[PDB]
Structure 1
Amino acid sequence: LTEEQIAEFKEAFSLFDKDGDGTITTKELGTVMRSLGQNPTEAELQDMINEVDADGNGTIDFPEFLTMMARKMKEEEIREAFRVFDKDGNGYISAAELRHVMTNLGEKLTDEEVDEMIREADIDGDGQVNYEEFVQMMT
């Protein structure tokens, strides 16, 4: 593990943890899932948590949050993720599209930050993320 990627995990944890109390609840999961176009049920949210709830307190702490990520790490889902960003359906995530999603997740980003992000996932250098580039990132 590197410092930078600890920080990124930490930023992500914070996207979910809207009230900043250090724990992620089903409500906070639901809220993020819905901001990404999904419509989870109470039961689905509880299942997700239950899967990695090592201490049985019903909420997600930082290591459990990493454990969620580790599990998923162990395609059709990637096409769907992709569509969340590629809102005009044109096959390319632009910087503005990336920004729109980040804003709907409540994240405040400088123009430069958004471009940095596109630039990291961009592989061919055309300045956008296409589908195969989104796959590599999810992979």
Structure 2
Amino acid sequence: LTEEQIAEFKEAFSLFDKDGDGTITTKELGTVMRSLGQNPTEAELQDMINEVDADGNGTIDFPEFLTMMARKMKEEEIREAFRVFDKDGNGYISAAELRHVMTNLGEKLTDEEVDEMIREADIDGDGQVNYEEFVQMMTA
């Protein structure tokens, strides 16, 4: 792992760690899932955490957080993720839609930070992320 991907994870973890206390409760997951158009039940949330709660303390810490991303880094599900960004369904995620989704996760992002993101997902250089390019990003 590089220095860059640690710092990425950190802010990733921090999208979830709303209250800054260094852990993600079910309530925070619930909150994020919903901001992403989802509606998970108390029980689902518990399972998510139960699946990687090594210390069995009922909440997610950083290490376990990374475990989650380790595990999911092992289709139909991809389209649904994509459709969360592709708000007008035209098949391309623009910066604006990316911005909107980030903002919707309580991110405040500079015009340029949005662009950097578009830029790192964008393979063909048309300045948007298409499904297939979205796919590569979901493959790392």
TM range (shorter): over 0.9
Measured after TM superposition, the shift of residue 74 of structure 1 is: 1.2
Measured after TM superposition, the shift of residue 62 of structure 1 is: 0.3
Whole-Å separation in 1 of the counterparts to 2:5 and 2:70? 14
Which digits, 9 at most, give the CA deviation of each residue in 1:29-80, with x for residues without a partner? 0000000000000000000000000010000000000001111111111100
Whole-Å separation in 2 of the counterparts to 1:43 and 1:62? 22
Measured after TM superposition, the shift of residue 117 of structure 1 is: 0.4
Moved over 6 A (4+): none
Measured after TM superposition, the shift of residue 25 of structure 1 is: 0.3
Measured after TM superposition, the shift of residue 83 of structure 1 is: 0.3
Q: What corresponds to 2:19 in structure 1?
A: 19
Measured after TM superposition, the shift of residue 84 of structure 1 is: 0.3
TM-score by length of 2: 0.99
Which digits, 9 at most, give the CA deviation of each residue in 1:71-117, with x for residues without a partner? 11111111000000000000000000000000000001000000010
TM-score by length of 1: 0.99
Q: What corresponds to 1:134 in structure 2?
A: 134
Whole-Å separation in 2 of the counterparts to 1:92 and 1:74? 26
Whole-Å separation in 1 of the counterparts to 2:52 and 2:129? 32
Between the two proteins, the alignment pairs up a number of residues equal to: 139
Whole-Å separation in 2 of the counterparts to 1:126 and 1:22? 39
Whole-Å separation in 1 of the counterparts to 2:53 and 2:138? 24
Whole-Å separation in 2 of the counterparts to 1:105 and 1:118? 17
Q: What corresponds to 1:44 in structure 2?
A: 44
Q: Secondary structure at the match of 2:33?
A: helix
Whole-Å separation in 2 of the counterparts to 1:83 and 1:54? 33
Q: What CA RMSD, in Å, does the superposition of the two structures yield over aligned residues?
A: 0.4
Provide structure 1 residue ranges, at least 5 long, that are not aligned to the other structure.
Answer: none
Provide structure 2 residue ranges, at least 5 long, that are not aligned to the other structure.
Answer: none
